[PDB]
Amino acid sequence: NLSFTDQHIKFWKKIPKQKAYSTVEQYGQLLDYGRSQGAFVGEGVLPDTNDS
Amino acid sequence: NLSFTDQHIKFWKKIPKQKAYSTVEQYGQLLDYGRSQGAFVGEGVLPDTNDS
């Protein structure tokens, strides 16, 4: 044999493998913990709301 | 998760902390030990007054 063999494959044996159950695979990401809108409010004042 | 975690907070966990008993906290400072003058007086001469 003058060509490569099994031991020359590196990335295919290193990437983790997971089982698929459909032709479309979905996943969810978290991007932010909230909007940057200022944290100081004052004495006895209800602070504003925020959303991630 | 695509954002930071608790381990990325460094300064808040390092600065020393003390309890506060009021909305106004007071302290005192010593600026200098006296204004620059001449320290050599001469024989039998009353030295000048100085203050910090």
Are A46 and B17 in contact, with CB atoms under 8 Å apart?
A: no
> What gap in Å lies between CA A42 and CA B41, rounded to an integer?
59
Please provide the distance, in angstroms rounded to a whole number, between the alpha carbons at the two ends of chain A.
59
Do the chains contact at B1 and A30, CB–CB below 8 Å?
A: yes
Q: How was this structure determined?
A: cryo-EM
Tokens of B16: 């020393």
A47: which residues sit within 8 A by CB, 6+ positions away? A39, A41
Q: Which residues in chain B have Cβ-Cβ distances shorter than 8 Å to A31?
A: 2-3
Single-letter amino acid, residue B26: Q
The structure was resolved to a resolution in Å of 3.0
- The 10 Å CB-count burial string (b at 16+, else e) for B17-49 is eeeeeeeeeeeeeeeeeeeeeeeeeeeeeeeee
Q: How far is A31 from chain B (nearest CA, A)?
A: 5
Q: Are B20 and A47 in contact (CB under 8 A)?
A: no
